[PDB]
Nucleic acid binder design. Structure first.
Ligand SMILES: Nc1ncnc2c1ncn2[C@H]1C[C@H](O)[C@@H](COP(=O)(O)OP(=O)(O)OP(=O)(O)O)O1
Ligand SMILES: [Ca+2]
Ligand SMILES: [Mg+2]
Length: 430
DNA sequence: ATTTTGACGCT
DNA sequence: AGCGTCAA
């Protein structure tokens, strides 16, 4: 009752760019705008692997992970843009730079946590308080929320999409108490007004559209964001949680899409997030551990305390290349040449990072996979990163992996290498 | 033969 | 530290 926390103490948003790499390529090449199109890396093997797909192309069934040759079978007029290739490998620089454009705009509104190349969480609690003080008891107009959905509404006693959206928004705004500056629902609504402004700024200043979720924590904001993609935002209130979770597959909640989620389903014999409420906290801890159990117990009630971390920049800078099938590296010269290629890209990115962000990486992580090994990585070894020099970094990586070559003949490498990975970590201010 | 990334947890 | 999980 009066002491049961309800996890309504924050306003958190999650902004996720729509079909991001596709929009970057469509901004650059207007011929691709409003077309079924996809972004592909490489081309020789089955037309290249698709990594991003416009919504027009998704209507034909085109998906990520599909080979372009296969996507063309579903969508013969599919347009394709290829990822840049530099030093023999795919180079994602254009998308990292576009990401910086968006992150820098979002940071004008609030502290952000960069969650991925095209997603950031926003802690809007303070901005909401300020905006509520400015508003001075003034009601919030539907015109301030032109792309907002209120999850769960309309309800109770038009057949078009926008009509339903407006009916739900009208019900929501009709039922708010605007004089109570401590109302969580009012706080979320002001949050959504701010997110409309943030999304408009992103689109105005970059050309890119995005979706967003607004709720009281990161997990619900993320879930909310996906409910009405693309180019829309969704408010998930605390009160919407029981109905929303009553038919929500467990795997849809962030962190439960893999083995742990499968084990929750198997061990407990349930399917939906809401079914978790019938277990005690101790029961969940007994099956899934102290941390996961407490997290599950609160999360299924819509409560999560994970903070929006103040971090706009990635914590690592990495370069990776697979060598599948017959391309596996089988000679010392091959391994050294590709380590150099990776190291040269890493050097270029690190030097730019040091100039832009006043920091230096101090550790180099080298990871490889050997042909035959079932694990993704066969070996992961660190060494010191003391100079931004590609030849030195490639030599040091070779030094830390050379003992993996079983072959008695020095010129041959066995078992052949199917993956090389260099990652700069442990940044210090400079 | 999706590939190329990142973050964080465990021991 | 090195390995594993989960997510763009
Ligand atoms: N598995 C992957 N491998 C390589 N790149 C990926 C992968 N998944 C996503 N990306 C890249 C391309 C995407 O445009 C970008 C953002 O990913 P993601 O948010 O999951 O999808 P998306 O932005 O393309 O579409 P949308 O968010 O509208 O559903 O990251
Ligand atoms: Ca996205
Ligand atoms: Mg994303």
């Amino acid at each position: 009752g009066p002491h049961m926390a309800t996890g309504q103490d924050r306003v958190v948003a999650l902004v996720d760019m729509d079909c991001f790499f596709v929009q970057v390529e469509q901004r650059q090449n207007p011929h691709l705008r409003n077309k079924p199109c996809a972004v592909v890396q490489y081309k020789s093997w089955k037309g290249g692997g698709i990594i991003a797909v416009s919504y027009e192309a998704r209507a034909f069934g085109v998906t990520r992970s599909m080979w372009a040759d296969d996507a063309k079978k579903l969508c013969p007029d599919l347009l394709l843009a290829q990822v840049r290739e530099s030093r023999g490998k795919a180079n994602l620089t254009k998308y990292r730079e576009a990401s910086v454009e968006v992150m820098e705009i979002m940071s004008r509104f609030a502290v952000i946590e960069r969650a991925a190349i095209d997603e950031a969480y926003v802690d809007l609690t303070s901005a909401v308080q300020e905006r509520l003080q400015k508003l001075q008891g003034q009601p919030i107009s539907a015109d301030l929320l032109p792309s907002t959905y209120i999850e769960g509404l309309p309800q109770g006693p038009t057949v078009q999409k926008e009509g339903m959206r407006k009916q739900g928004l009208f019900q929501w705004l009709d039922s708010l108490q605007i004089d109570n500056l401590t109302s969580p629902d009012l706080q979320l609504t002001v949050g959504a007004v701010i997110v409309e402004e943030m999304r408009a700024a992103i689109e105005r200043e970059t050309g890119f559209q995005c979706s967003a979720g607004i709720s009281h924590n990161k997990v619900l904001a993320k879930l909310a964001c996906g409910l009405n993609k693309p180019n829309r935002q969704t408010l998930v209130s605390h009160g919407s949680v029981p109905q929303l979770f009553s038919q929500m597959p467990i795997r849809k909640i962030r962190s439960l899409g893999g083995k742990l989620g499968a084990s929750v389903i198997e061990i407990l014999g349930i399917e939906y997030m809401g079914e978790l409420t019938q277990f005690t906290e101790s029961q969940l801890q007994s099956h899934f551990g102290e941390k996961n159990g407490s997290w599950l117990y609160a999360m299924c009630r819509g409560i999560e305390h994970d903070p929006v971390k103040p971090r706009q920049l990635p914590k690592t800078i990495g370069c990776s290349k697979n060598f599948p099938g017959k391309t596996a590296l089988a000679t010392r010269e091959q391994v050294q040449w590709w380590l150099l290629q990776l190291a040269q890209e890493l050097e270029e990115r690190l030097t730019k990072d040091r100039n832009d962000n006043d920091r230096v990486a101090t550790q180099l992580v080298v990871s490889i996979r050997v042909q035959g090994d079932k694990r993704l990585s066969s070996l992961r070894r660190c060494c010191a990163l003391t100079r931004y020099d590609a030849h030195k970094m490639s030599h040091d990586a070779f030094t830390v992996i050379k003992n993996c070559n079983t072959s008695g003949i020095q010129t041959e490498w066995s078992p052949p290498l199917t993956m090389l990975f260099l990652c700069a970590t442990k940044f210090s201010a400079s």
